[PDB]
Design a protein around this ligand. Structure first.
Ligand code: A1BWS
Length: 212
């Protein structure tokens, strides 16, 4: 794999979103990976519905949090609508997939990156955007305004984001806190520290959708 990967430059990343007060990072995270892989396979960059996952993933807890892997499993089993058809409301409501006609896209499955393995994550990011988790509760992460972020942070992972690239010393992360946060909504997190947890626990739990 190359020394630099940046899916934004391959047109596989949609504009940065703001999840708002709702604890929907898990759905925003999953949608990035769906947006990326559908671009990769079909050549079309579309936006898909975080709100659909928020409302319809019964294994997750809506705005109280959830699981990127189950959201990704939901898209593999059923599918997902365009963000336009099913826009973000920032609150969990009932699942309205049926009232919005045919799914716009469907994946074929979900895989886990082997955890606590930096090479395995980079290998996956070289193929497509990956859903990853990290500890975002610390003030240093929250007040991040740019640069390669080294912490401080623990591994009490609490926030699902999406890795859409990497470099020699960092993994490039799309956050869902709007374009005002970080680097136009992104964060470069240090890699290659030998911490098998990853900085801020970045290697704890990573998933990506499969699209044949
Ligand atoms: C993240 C967010 O929206 O800031 C959520 O709070 C969330 O889904 N958390 C989730 C754990 C991560 C997937 C690691 C949970 N169940 O706490």
């Amino acid at each position: 794999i190359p020394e630099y990967v940046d899916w934004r430059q391959k047109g596989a990343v949609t504009p940065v979103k703001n999840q708002g007060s709702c604890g929907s990072c898990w759905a925003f995270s999953a949608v990035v990976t769906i947006e990326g892989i559908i671009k990769i396979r079909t050549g079309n960059l579309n936006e898909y519905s975080e709100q659909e996952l928020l409302d319809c993933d019964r294994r997750s807890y809506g705005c109280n949090g959830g699981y990127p892997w189950s959201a990704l499993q939901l898209v593999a089993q059923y599918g997902i609508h365009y963000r336009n058809t099913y826009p973000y409301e920032g609150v969990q409501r009932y699942c309205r997939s049926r009232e919005k006609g045919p799914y716009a896209a469907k994946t074929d499955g979900v895989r886990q990156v082997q955890p606590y393995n930096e090479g395995a994550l980079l290998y996956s990011i070289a193929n497509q955007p990956v859903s990853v988790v990290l500890e975002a509760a610390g003030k240093d992460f929250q007040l991040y305004r740019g640069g390669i972020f080294v912490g401080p942070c623990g591994n009490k992972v609490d926030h699902a984001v999406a890795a859409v690239g990497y470099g020699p010393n960092y993994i490039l992360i799309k956050n869902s806190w709007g374009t005002g946060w970080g680097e136009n909504g992104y964060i470069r997190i240090k890699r290659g520290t030998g911490n098998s947890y990853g900085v801020c626990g970045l290697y704890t739990s990573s998933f990506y959708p499969v699209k044949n």
